[PDB]
Structure formats: structure tokens, C-alpha cells
């Protein structure tokens, strides 16, 4: 009769957000993005993407860490696996490439929980939390994981991004603002028993 | 690097849906419903509600079992805990009262997973997957659980209800049809590794 996973949260003021050099996107436009997805599909099949959900609290209110590219899109930290790369090692590699320190001290990433799966049927924006009817060759599969933070840490934010802490109410029913994966994080996080340290 | 929970699904044709006498709602109207919630809040505080999510497949496509009252609302099987009642024993009690057999043979209910939490701030329809800002006395707290079915079973459906199997695509982004809890089941179920037996 205690079936919820227990997750420790720490205050946002426990974390230090330093700076490092810009990290440029792999694609210069939407059209370039879907051309490269089409080219790689022909060589190695479906794109395998992993993303991390990192939580803090302020005054006992959970907040998700988002990376905002300039003043455009909000992103979760993550990216593309290489062929034959383990999903959990890969997400740890990508989070170190995005938020890892200038002084080369390693973060202690802890990943123990899957919180969802999304599939892209075509070389187009629509994504779904299932494989849609009649679709045998999805073009992309995304896997989301909860990343348990340590009590304190220093993250290095690439200079072209801002790290922003968003409360759950601002994400909720806000697909226009955040799109369909980030806007459904409130519902996906509701199963956890958060401890406010 | 295998962090997903594994869940066995069986075909819908493995299950027999018999009939029994009507099960009438506790409240004859929305106004009667929120009057009784207001009366009980004053005596025992917040309403504690539990609901079950029961999954099958047909042709390897997952479907959620829904109870439709005549041709109005779709419902998950569930209901109200009594004061000091355990959540998991309570859901097993309520599922036996709704779908338990006329011949008094017990179902073997297996409940091992929480899939979400919803909170009602006021004596009004709005519900959220978090406690909203400034709300210290929520009026209702709902807990949803995944109910693992056995390979075969006979359920007795009250005569005033139809048991319906809905695919995930029909629930997805369909709050008008199903409301905000049932329409977010696709996203909440995406973390499971379903086995299609
Ligand atoms: O690439 C990321 N997430 C995977 C999903 N994608 C791909 C294109 C845009 C997007 O959100 N995230 C990310 C965040 C900061 C720096 C670098 C990468
Ligand atoms: O009561 C149920 N679920 C809890 C949430 N509520 C309360 C009012 C309507 C609603 O969906 N479910 C249910 C299903 C079949 C028969 C009897 C009960
Ligand atoms: Zn405070
Ligand atoms: Zn895949
Ligand atoms: Zn078949
Ligand atoms: Zn509560």
C-alpha cells in the first residue's frame, strides 16, 4: 500500500548555473532538420532520441529545468543515440556534453525511471505517445527519463541558452507554449512522491 | 538499461462480459453531487477516490476498459474510500462491487503500479495533476492504479452500464469526449513495456 516511487527534490538556490561556449544546433532550419532525418533513416533506420527531466523545488513547489535557445523554443536536455549505444549511457553522455563543467569535474547523474515514450510516424512535426495505426516504420522514437539530482551541483550553461525553472501549472494544458511532450510533464510526474529537502 | 515495467496483455476475446442487476449512482444530479461533497468535507475532510485502469489487446493494439453509463459519461471502475481504509484494499473492494460475479467467485486483482494523482481545489468540476497555488484544503484527491488482469476472466457488468474497449488513439487529445484524466491515459501508459500474449 505504498506503491509510489520516492524522489528527493532540493531548492533551486542549491544549484550554481555558470557559463561556457555556445553549443550550435546540428540543423540550421526545419527543412534541413527533416532532410537529415530522411538521409539517416535510409542508412541506419529509425532515429533513437533520449531526453532528461531534471526537477528542483522553490518554497516546496516542484519546477522542471528547461533550456531555452535564445528567446525561441524550450528544450529538454538530450539528443540522438549513436548506433548500438545504450540508452542510459547515451543520455548521461549527452547531459555531460550540454551541462558538464568547464573545469572537467563529472556530474553524478542518477537515472532509474522511464516516464514516457513518443513516436514520429512521418518526416513531419506530429508525434504521439503510441505507434499510430498502419505505421510499421516510425521515423523517430523518443524515450524520456527522470534524472535524480544530487543535493548541490554547478552546471555550465552554453552561452546561446538560458536554464529556466518552470512550475508545473505553467506547463499544464500549454501545448501552444511548450508543445505536446513538455506540456504533458505535469500528468507524467503526478505518480512520484516528492520529498522537499 | 532496462528501466520499463513489463505488463502482460491478453486478447479481449479471452474475457467474458456477463450481466447483473443495475448499480445506481450515489447522486441524482451534478448539484446533488457537489452538495454531498460539501456536507462530507465538513465531517471527514477531503474525499479520497481510487480508480483502476484495466488493459487488454486486440490484434496487438492496447485498449482500456471503460464503463459507459447508458449513452452518457465514460467512467473508470472505482469510487470513494471509507475513513481509515487502505487505498489498494479499497480499490479491490470497489472493483469487486462493480464487476464481481453473480456466482460469488473472486477475481484475482493484481495492483502493483501508481500511474497518477489528481486534485480538486473547489466544490466544482476543475481537477489538476498537482495541488494548485494557494490551495491548502483540496476538496478531493484521486489516485489512479494499473490493474494487471489474469489470462482469462468473467466480469459481471451492471445492466445500466456497457463495458467498452477503447484504443489509445481515440482517447488521445479527446478531453471533450472523455475529460482530462481519461484523455491523458495514452501519455501515462507510454512508460510500460506491454507483452501481447
Ligand atoms: O536536442 C535536444 N533535445 C532533443 C529533441 N530536439 C531535437 C531538436 C530540438 C529538440 O528539442 N535538446 C538539447 C538541449 C540543449 C542543447 C542541445 C540539445
Ligand atoms: O465512480 C466511479 N469513478 C470515480 C469517479 N466518478 C465519481 C462520479 C463519476 C465518476 O467518474 N466509477 C464507477 C464506475 C462504474 C460504476 C460505479 C462507479
Ligand atoms: Zn519557503
Ligand atoms: Zn523504437
Ligand atoms: Zn491478429
Ligand atoms: Zn490527499
CSV table of C-alpha atoms and ligand atoms in Angstrom, one decimal:
chain,number,residue,atom,x,y,z
A,1,UNK,CA,0.0,0.0,0.0
A,2,UNK,CA,3.0,2.3,-0.7
A,3,UNK,CA,3.4,1.9,-4.5
A,4,UNK,CA,4.7,5.4,-5.4
A,5,UNK,CA,8.4,5.9,-6.2
A,6,UNK,CA,10.0,8.4,-3.7
A,7,UNK,CA,12.2,11.2,-5.3
A,8,UNK,CA,14.3,13.8,-3.4
A,9,UNK,CA,14.0,17.5,-4.5
A,10,UNK,CA,16.4,20.3,-3.4
A,11,UNK,CA,15.9,24.1,-3.5
A,12,UNK,CA,16.9,25.9,-6.8
A,13,UNK,CA,19.3,28.1,-4.7
A,14,UNK,CA,21.3,24.9,-4.0
A,15,UNK,CA,22.4,24.8,-7.7
A,16,UNK,CA,25.0,27.2,-9.4
A,17,UNK,CA,24.4,28.0,-13.2
A,18,UNK,CA,27.8,29.1,-14.7
A,19,UNK,CA,28.5,29.7,-18.5
A,20,UNK,CA,30.6,28.1,-21.3
A,21,UNK,CA,30.9,28.5,-25.1
A,22,UNK,CA,27.9,28.3,-27.4
A,23,UNK,CA,26.6,24.8,-28.4
A,24,UNK,CA,25.2,25.2,-32.0
A,25,UNK,CA,22.2,23.1,-33.3
A,26,UNK,CA,23.0,20.3,-35.8
A,27,UNK,CA,20.4,21.7,-38.3
A,28,UNK,CA,20.2,25.4,-39.5
A,29,UNK,CA,16.3,25.1,-40.3
A,30,UNK,CA,13.2,22.9,-40.0
A,31,UNK,CA,13.7,21.9,-43.7
A,32,UNK,CA,17.4,21.0,-43.0
A,33,UNK,CA,16.3,19.0,-39.9
A,34,UNK,CA,13.8,16.8,-41.8
A,35,UNK,CA,16.2,16.4,-44.8
A,36,UNK,CA,18.9,15.0,-42.4
A,37,UNK,CA,16.3,12.7,-40.7
A,38,UNK,CA,15.3,11.3,-44.2
A,39,UNK,CA,19.1,10.8,-45.2
A,40,UNK,CA,20.0,9.0,-41.9
A,41,UNK,CA,16.8,6.8,-42.0
A,42,UNK,CA,17.9,5.4,-45.3
A,43,UNK,CA,21.4,4.5,-43.8
A,44,UNK,CA,20.6,3.4,-40.1
A,45,UNK,CA,16.8,3.3,-39.8
A,46,UNK,CA,14.7,5.0,-37.1
A,47,UNK,CA,16.2,7.9,-35.1
A,48,UNK,CA,16.7,7.0,-31.4
A,49,UNK,CA,16.3,10.1,-29.2
A,50,UNK,CA,16.7,10.3,-25.3
A,51,UNK,CA,15.8,13.3,-23.1
A,52,UNK,CA,16.2,14.0,-19.3
A,53,UNK,CA,13.7,15.6,-16.9
A,54,UNK,CA,15.6,17.4,-14.0
A,55,UNK,CA,13.5,18.7,-11.1
A,56,UNK,CA,14.1,21.2,-8.2
A,57,UNK,CA,11.8,23.0,-5.8
A,58,UNK,CA,11.4,26.5,-4.6
A,59,UNK,CA,9.3,27.0,-1.4
A,60,UNK,CA,8.1,23.3,-1.8
A,61,UNK,CA,6.7,23.9,-5.4
A,62,UNK,CA,8.3,21.5,-8.0
A,63,UNK,CA,9.9,23.1,-11.1
A,64,UNK,CA,11.3,21.4,-14.3
A,65,UNK,CA,14.6,22.7,-15.7
A,66,UNK,CA,14.2,23.8,-19.4
A,67,UNK,CA,16.9,25.0,-21.9
A,68,UNK,CA,15.7,28.0,-23.8
A,69,UNK,CA,17.6,28.6,-27.1
A,70,UNK,CA,17.8,32.5,-27.1
A,71,UNK,CA,14.2,33.6,-26.8
A,72,UNK,CA,12.7,30.8,-29.2
A,73,UNK,CA,12.0,27.1,-28.3
A,74,UNK,CA,12.1,25.4,-24.9
A,75,UNK,CA,14.0,22.1,-24.9
A,76,UNK,CA,14.7,19.2,-22.5
A,77,UNK,CA,18.5,18.3,-22.3
A,78,UNK,CA,19.0,15.3,-24.6
A,79,UNK,CA,19.7,14.3,-28.2
A,80,UNK,CA,20.4,11.4,-30.6
A,81,UNK,CA,22.0,8.0,-29.7
A,82,UNK,CA,24.7,6.6,-32.0
A,83,UNK,CA,24.2,3.1,-33.5
A,84,UNK,CA,24.4,0.4,-30.8
A,85,UNK,CA,24.7,2.9,-28.0
A,86,UNK,CA,22.9,2.0,-24.6
A,87,UNK,CA,20.0,4.5,-23.8
A,88,UNK,CA,21.1,5.3,-20.2
A,89,UNK,CA,24.8,5.7,-21.1
A,90,UNK,CA,23.8,7.8,-24.1
A,91,UNK,CA,21.6,10.2,-22.0
A,92,UNK,CA,24.5,10.6,-19.5
A,93,UNK,CA,26.9,11.4,-22.4
A,94,UNK,CA,24.5,14.0,-23.9
A,95,UNK,CA,23.7,15.7,-20.5
A,96,UNK,CA,27.5,16.0,-19.8
A,97,UNK,CA,28.0,17.5,-23.3
A,98,UNK,CA,25.3,20.1,-22.6
A,99,UNK,CA,25.6,21.0,-18.9
A,100,UNK,CA,29.1,19.4,-18.0
A,101,UNK,CA,31.7,21.7,-16.3
A,102,UNK,CA,34.5,23.9,-18.0
A,103,UNK,CA,36.9,22.5,-15.2
A,104,UNK,CA,36.1,18.9,-16.1
A,105,UNK,CA,34.6,17.6,-12.8
A,106,UNK,CA,31.9,15.0,-13.5
A,107,UNK,CA,28.3,15.3,-12.5
A,108,UNK,CA,26.9,12.2,-10.7
A,109,UNK,CA,23.9,11.5,-13.0
A,110,UNK,CA,21.4,9.1,-11.4
A,111,UNK,CA,18.8,7.6,-13.9
A,112,UNK,CA,16.4,4.9,-12.5
A,113,UNK,CA,12.9,5.8,-14.0
A,114,UNK,CA,11.3,5.9,-17.5
A,115,UNK,CA,8.5,8.4,-17.6
A,116,UNK,CA,7.4,8.1,-21.3
A,117,UNK,CA,7.8,7.0,-25.0
A,118,UNK,CA,6.8,9.2,-28.1
A,119,UNK,CA,6.9,8.1,-31.8
A,120,UNK,CA,7.1,10.2,-35.0
A,121,UNK,CA,5.3,8.3,-37.9
A,122,UNK,CA,6.5,10.6,-40.8
A,123,UNK,CA,9.3,13.2,-41.6
A,124,UNK,CA,6.9,15.9,-40.2
A,125,UNK,CA,6.3,17.6,-36.8
A,126,UNK,CA,3.4,15.3,-35.4
A,127,UNK,CA,4.4,12.9,-32.5
A,128,UNK,CA,2.2,10.5,-30.5
A,129,UNK,CA,2.5,8.6,-27.1
A,130,UNK,CA,1.9,5.3,-29.1
A,131,UNK,CA,2.8,3.8,-32.6
A,132,UNK,CA,-0.3,5.0,-34.8
A,133,UNK,CA,-2.5,2.6,-36.8
A,134,UNK,CA,-1.0,1.3,-40.0
A,135,UNK,CA,2.6,2.6,-39.1
A,136,UNK,CA,5.2,-0.2,-39.4
A,137,UNK,CA,8.3,2.1,-39.9
A,138,UNK,CA,8.2,5.0,-37.5
A,139,UNK,CA,10.9,7.6,-38.4
A,140,UNK,CA,11.8,8.6,-34.7
A,141,UNK,CA,11.4,7.0,-31.3
A,142,UNK,CA,11.9,9.4,-28.2
A,143,UNK,CA,12.5,7.9,-24.6
A,144,UNK,CA,12.1,10.3,-21.6
A,145,UNK,CA,13.8,9.6,-18.2
A,146,UNK,CA,13.6,11.2,-14.7
A,147,UNK,CA,17.2,12.4,-13.7
A,148,UNK,CA,17.6,12.5,-9.8
A,149,UNK,CA,19.8,15.5,-8.9
A,150,UNK,CA,22.4,15.5,-6.1
A,151,UNK,CA,21.8,17.9,-3.1
A,152,UNK,CA,24.1,20.6,-4.8
A,153,UNK,CA,25.8,21.0,-8.3
A,154,UNK,CA,27.4,23.6,-10.7
A,155,UNK,CA,26.1,23.3,-14.2
A,156,UNK,CA,27.8,25.1,-17.2
A,157,UNK,CA,25.1,26.5,-19.5
A,158,UNK,CA,26.1,27.1,-23.1
A,159,UNK,CA,26.2,31.0,-23.7
A,160,UNK,CA,23.5,30.7,-26.5
A,161,UNK,CA,21.0,29.0,-24.0
A,162,UNK,CA,19.2,30.1,-20.7
A,163,UNK,CA,18.4,27.4,-18.0
A,164,UNK,CA,14.9,28.3,-16.7
A,165,UNK,CA,12.9,26.7,-13.8
A,166,UNK,CA,9.2,26.3,-14.8
A,167,UNK,CA,6.5,25.4,-12.4
A,168,UNK,CA,4.0,22.6,-13.3
A,169,UNK,CA,1.0,24.9,-13.5
A,170,UNK,CA,2.6,26.9,-16.3
A,171,UNK,CA,3.3,23.7,-18.4
A,172,UNK,CA,-0.2,22.3,-17.8
A,173,UNK,CA,-2.6,22.4,-20.9
A,174,UNK,CA,0.0,24.8,-22.6
A,175,UNK,CA,0.9,22.8,-25.9
A,176,UNK,CA,1.0,26.2,-27.8
A,177,UNK,CA,3.8,27.4,-25.5
A,178,UNK,CA,5.8,24.2,-25.0
A,179,UNK,CA,4.4,21.5,-27.4
A,180,UNK,CA,2.8,18.2,-26.5
A,181,UNK,CA,5.7,16.4,-24.7
A,182,UNK,CA,6.7,19.2,-22.3
A,183,UNK,CA,3.0,20.3,-21.7
A,184,UNK,CA,2.2,16.7,-20.6
A,185,UNK,CA,5.0,16.5,-17.9
A,186,UNK,CA,2.6,17.5,-15.0
A,187,UNK,CA,0.4,14.4,-15.7
A,188,UNK,CA,3.6,12.2,-16.2
A,189,UNK,CA,5.2,13.4,-12.9
A,190,UNK,CA,2.0,13.1,-10.7
A,191,UNK,CA,2.8,9.4,-9.8
A,192,UNK,CA,6.0,10.4,-7.8
A,193,UNK,CA,6.2,11.0,-4.1
A,194,UNK,CA,8.4,14.2,-4.0
A,195,UNK,CA,10.4,14.9,-0.7
A,196,UNK,CA,11.1,18.7,-0.3
A,197,UNK,CA,14.6,18.9,1.3
B,1,UNK,CA,19.4,-0.2,-19.1
B,2,UNK,CA,16.0,-1.9,-18.9
B,3,UNK,CA,14.1,0.5,-16.7
B,4,UNK,CA,10.5,0.0,-18.0
B,5,UNK,CA,7.9,-2.1,-16.0
B,6,UNK,CA,6.8,-5.2,-18.1
B,7,UNK,CA,3.0,-5.8,-18.2
B,8,UNK,CA,1.2,-8.8,-19.7
B,9,UNK,CA,-1.8,-8.0,-22.0
B,10,UNK,CA,-4.3,-10.7,-23.3
B,11,UNK,CA,-6.8,-10.6,-26.1
B,12,UNK,CA,-10.3,-9.1,-25.4
B,13,UNK,CA,-11.8,-12.4,-26.7
B,14,UNK,CA,-10.2,-14.1,-23.6
B,15,UNK,CA,-12.7,-12.2,-21.4
B,16,UNK,CA,-16.4,-13.0,-20.8
B,17,UNK,CA,-18.7,-10.0,-20.1
B,18,UNK,CA,-21.9,-11.3,-18.3
B,19,UNK,CA,-24.8,-9.1,-16.7
B,20,UNK,CA,-26.1,-8.4,-13.2
B,21,UNK,CA,-28.6,-6.0,-11.6
B,22,UNK,CA,-28.3,-2.2,-12.1
B,23,UNK,CA,-25.8,-0.3,-9.8
B,24,UNK,CA,-27.3,3.2,-9.3
B,25,UNK,CA,-25.2,6.4,-8.8
B,26,UNK,CA,-25.0,7.8,-5.2
B,27,UNK,CA,-26.0,11.3,-6.6
B,28,UNK,CA,-29.1,12.0,-8.8
B,29,UNK,CA,-27.5,15.2,-10.3
B,30,UNK,CA,-24.3,17.4,-10.5
B,31,UNK,CA,-25.9,19.8,-7.9
B,32,UNK,CA,-26.7,16.8,-5.5
B,33,UNK,CA,-23.1,15.5,-6.2
B,34,UNK,CA,-21.3,18.8,-5.1
B,35,UNK,CA,-23.8,19.3,-2.1
B,36,UNK,CA,-22.9,15.8,-0.7
B,37,UNK,CA,-19.1,16.5,-1.3
B,38,UNK,CA,-19.6,19.8,0.8
B,39,UNK,CA,-21.5,18.0,3.6
B,40,UNK,CA,-18.9,15.2,3.9
B,41,UNK,CA,-15.9,17.6,3.7
B,42,UNK,CA,-17.3,19.3,6.9
B,43,UNK,CA,-17.5,15.9,8.8
B,44,UNK,CA,-14.4,13.9,7.5
B,45,UNK,CA,-12.4,16.3,5.3
B,46,UNK,CA,-11.1,15.7,1.8
B,47,UNK,CA,-12.7,13.0,-0.4
B,48,UNK,CA,-10.3,10.1,-1.1
B,49,UNK,CA,-11.1,8.5,-4.6
B,50,UNK,CA,-9.4,5.5,-6.2
B,51,UNK,CA,-9.7,4.3,-9.8
B,52,UNK,CA,-8.5,1.3,-11.8
B,53,UNK,CA,-7.0,1.1,-15.4
B,54,UNK,CA,-7.7,-2.3,-16.9
B,55,UNK,CA,-5.9,-3.1,-20.3
B,56,UNK,CA,-6.4,-5.8,-23.0
B,57,UNK,CA,-5.3,-6.0,-26.6
B,58,UNK,CA,-6.9,-6.9,-29.9
B,59,UNK,CA,-4.5,-7.8,-32.8
B,60,UNK,CA,-1.6,-6.4,-30.7
B,61,UNK,CA,-3.3,-2.8,-30.2
B,62,UNK,CA,-3.8,-1.9,-26.5
B,63,UNK,CA,-7.3,-1.0,-25.4
B,64,UNK,CA,-8.5,0.5,-21.9
B,65,UNK,CA,-11.8,-0.9,-20.5
B,66,UNK,CA,-14.3,1.9,-19.8
B,67,UNK,CA,-17.8,1.7,-18.2
B,68,UNK,CA,-20.3,3.7,-20.0
B,69,UNK,CA,-23.4,4.7,-18.0
B,70,UNK,CA,-26.3,4.3,-20.6
B,71,UNK,CA,-25.1,6.5,-23.5
B,72,UNK,CA,-23.7,9.4,-21.3
B,73,UNK,CA,-20.3,9.6,-19.4
B,74,UNK,CA,-17.4,7.1,-19.7
B,75,UNK,CA,-16.0,6.1,-16.3
B,76,UNK,CA,-13.1,4.2,-14.9
B,77,UNK,CA,-14.1,1.5,-12.3
B,78,UNK,CA,-13.5,3.0,-8.8
B,79,UNK,CA,-15.1,5.1,-6.1
B,80,UNK,CA,-14.7,6.6,-2.6
B,81,UNK,CA,-12.6,5.1,0.3
B,82,UNK,CA,-14.1,5.0,3.7
B,83,UNK,CA,-12.3,6.7,6.6
B,84,UNK,CA,-9.1,4.8,7.5
B,85,UNK,CA,-9.4,2.4,4.6
B,86,UNK,CA,-6.2,1.3,2.8
B,87,UNK,CA,-6.1,2.6,-0.9
B,88,UNK,CA,-5.2,-0.8,-2.5
B,89,UNK,CA,-7.7,-2.9,-0.4
B,90,UNK,CA,-10.3,-0.2,-1.1
B,91,UNK,CA,-9.9,-0.3,-4.9
B,92,UNK,CA,-10.1,-4.1,-4.8
B,93,UNK,CA,-13.3,-3.8,-2.8
B,94,UNK,CA,-14.8,-1.3,-5.3
B,95,UNK,CA,-13.8,-3.2,-8.4
B,96,UNK,CA,-15.5,-6.4,-6.8
B,97,UNK,CA,-18.6,-4.4,-6.1
B,98,UNK,CA,-18.8,-3.1,-9.8
B,99,UNK,CA,-17.5,-6.2,-11.9
B,100,UNK,CA,-17.6,-9.1,-9.3
B,101,UNK,CA,-19.6,-12.3,-10.3
B,102,UNK,CA,-23.3,-13.2,-9.6
B,103,UNK,CA,-22.0,-16.7,-8.6
B,104,UNK,CA,-19.6,-15.2,-5.9
B,105,UNK,CA,-16.2,-16.5,-7.3
B,106,UNK,CA,-13.5,-13.9,-6.6
B,107,UNK,CA,-11.4,-12.1,-9.2
B,108,UNK,CA,-7.7,-12.2,-8.6
B,109,UNK,CA,-7.0,-8.4,-8.7
B,110,UNK,CA,-3.2,-7.6,-9.0
B,111,UNK,CA,-2.3,-3.9,-8.3
B,112,UNK,CA,1.4,-3.0,-8.2
B,113,UNK,CA,1.7,0.4,-10.0
B,114,UNK,CA,0.5,4.0,-9.4
B,115,UNK,CA,0.0,5.8,-12.7
B,116,UNK,CA,-1.2,9.3,-11.4
B,117,UNK,CA,-2.6,11.7,-8.8
B,118,UNK,CA,-5.4,14.4,-9.5
B,119,UNK,CA,-6.6,17.1,-7.0
B,120,UNK,CA,-9.9,19.1,-7.0
B,121,UNK,CA,-9.3,22.6,-5.3
B,122,UNK,CA,-13.1,23.6,-5.0
B,123,UNK,CA,-16.6,22.1,-5.0
B,124,UNK,CA,-16.6,22.5,-8.8
B,125,UNK,CA,-15.6,20.3,-11.9
B,126,UNK,CA,-11.9,21.5,-12.4
B,127,UNK,CA,-9.2,18.9,-11.5
B,128,UNK,CA,-5.4,19.2,-11.9
B,129,UNK,CA,-2.4,16.8,-11.8
B,130,UNK,CA,-0.9,18.9,-8.9
B,131,UNK,CA,-2.2,20.9,-5.8
B,132,UNK,CA,-2.7,24.4,-7.3
B,133,UNK,CA,-1.0,27.6,-6.0
B,134,UNK,CA,-2.6,29.0,-2.7
B,135,UNK,CA,-4.7,25.8,-2.2
B,136,UNK,CA,-4.2,24.4,1.4
B,137,UNK,CA,-7.5,22.4,1.7
B,138,UNK,CA,-8.2,20.5,-1.6
B,139,UNK,CA,-11.8,19.0,-1.6
B,140,UNK,CA,-10.9,15.7,-3.4
B,141,UNK,CA,-7.8,13.7,-4.1
B,142,UNK,CA,-7.9,10.9,-6.8
B,143,UNK,CA,-5.3,8.1,-7.1
B,144,UNK,CA,-5.1,6.0,-10.4
B,145,UNK,CA,-3.6,2.5,-10.4
B,146,UNK,CA,-2.8,0.0,-13.2
B,147,UNK,CA,-4.8,-3.3,-12.6
B,148,UNK,CA,-2.9,-6.4,-14.2
B,149,UNK,CA,-5.6,-8.8,-15.5
B,150,UNK,CA,-5.3,-12.6,-15.4
B,151,UNK,CA,-5.1,-14.5,-18.8
B,152,UNK,CA,-8.9,-15.1,-18.7
B,153,UNK,CA,-11.9,-13.8,-16.5
B,154,UNK,CA,-15.8,-13.4,-16.5
B,155,UNK,CA,-16.9,-10.0,-15.4
B,156,UNK,CA,-20.5,-9.2,-14.4
B,157,UNK,CA,-21.5,-5.8,-15.9
B,158,UNK,CA,-24.3,-4.0,-14.1
B,159,UNK,CA,-27.3,-3.9,-16.6
B,160,UNK,CA,-27.4,0.0,-16.6
B,161,UNK,CA,-23.7,0.1,-17.9
B,162,UNK,CA,-21.8,-1.2,-21.1
B,163,UNK,CA,-18.1,-2.3,-20.8
B,164,UNK,CA,-16.3,-0.8,-23.9
B,165,UNK,CA,-12.7,-1.3,-25.1
B,166,UNK,CA,-11.2,2.0,-26.3
B,167,UNK,CA,-7.9,2.2,-28.3
B,168,UNK,CA,-5.4,4.7,-27.2
B,169,UNK,CA,-5.6,6.8,-30.4
B,170,UNK,CA,-9.4,7.5,-29.7
B,171,UNK,CA,-8.6,8.8,-26.1
B,172,UNK,CA,-5.6,11.0,-27.2
B,173,UNK,CA,-6.2,14.7,-27.3
B,174,UNK,CA,-10.0,14.0,-26.7
B,175,UNK,CA,-10.8,15.9,-23.4
B,176,UNK,CA,-14.2,16.9,-24.9
B,177,UNK,CA,-15.2,13.2,-25.3
B,178,UNK,CA,-13.6,11.7,-22.1
B,179,UNK,CA,-12.4,14.6,-19.9
B,180,UNK,CA,-8.8,15.4,-18.8
B,181,UNK,CA,-8.0,12.3,-16.8
B,182,UNK,CA,-9.1,9.5,-19.3
B,183,UNK,CA,-7.8,11.6,-22.3
B,184,UNK,CA,-4.3,11.7,-20.7
B,185,UNK,CA,-4.1,7.8,-20.3
B,186,UNK,CA,-2.1,7.4,-23.6
B,187,UNK,CA,0.7,9.6,-22.2
B,188,UNK,CA,0.5,7.9,-18.7
B,189,UNK,CA,0.6,4.4,-20.2
B,190,UNK,CA,3.5,5.1,-22.6
B,191,UNK,CA,6.2,4.1,-20.0
B,192,UNK,CA,5.1,0.4,-19.9
B,193,UNK,CA,6.6,-2.4,-21.8
B,194,UNK,CA,3.4,-4.3,-22.9
B,195,UNK,CA,3.7,-8.1,-23.8
B,196,UNK,CA,0.9,-9.1,-26.4
B,197,UNK,CA,0.0,-12.7,-25.3
C,1,LIG,O1,18.3,18.2,-28.7
C,1,LIG,C1,17.6,18.3,-27.6
C,1,LIG,N1,16.5,17.5,-27.4
C,1,LIG,C2,16.1,16.5,-28.3
C,1,LIG,C3,14.9,17.0,-29.2
C,1,LIG,N2,15.1,18.1,-30.0
C,1,LIG,C4,15.9,17.9,-31.2
C,1,LIG,C5,15.7,19.3,-32.0
C,1,LIG,C6,15.1,20.2,-31.0
C,1,LIG,C7,14.7,19.3,-29.8
C,1,LIG,O2,14.1,19.7,-28.8
C,1,LIG,N3,18.0,19.0,-26.5
C,1,LIG,C8,19.1,20.0,-26.4
C,1,LIG,C9,19.0,20.9,-25.4
C,1,LIG,C10,20.1,21.8,-25.3
C,1,LIG,C11,21.2,21.8,-26.1
C,1,LIG,C12,21.2,20.8,-27.1
C,1,LIG,C13,20.2,19.9,-27.3
C,2,LIG,O1,-17.4,6.2,-9.5
C,2,LIG,C1,-16.5,5.8,-10.4
C,2,LIG,N1,-15.4,6.5,-10.5
C,2,LIG,C2,-15.0,7.6,-9.6
C,2,LIG,C3,-15.2,9.0,-10.2
C,2,LIG,N2,-16.5,9.3,-10.5
C,2,LIG,C4,-17.5,9.7,-9.5
C,2,LIG,C5,-18.7,10.2,-10.2
C,2,LIG,C6,-18.5,9.8,-11.6
C,2,LIG,C7,-17.1,9.3,-11.7
C,2,LIG,O2,-16.5,9.0,-12.8
C,2,LIG,N3,-16.7,4.8,-11.2
C,2,LIG,C8,-17.8,3.9,-11.3
C,2,LIG,C9,-17.9,3.1,-12.5
C,2,LIG,C10,-18.9,2.2,-12.6
C,2,LIG,C11,-19.9,2.1,-11.6
C,2,LIG,C12,-19.8,2.8,-10.5
C,2,LIG,C13,-18.7,3.7,-10.3
C,3,LIG,ZN1,9.8,28.9,1.7
C,4,LIG,ZN1,11.7,2.1,-31.4
C,5,LIG,ZN1,-4.4,-10.5,-35.2
C,6,LIG,ZN1,-4.6,14.0,-0.3
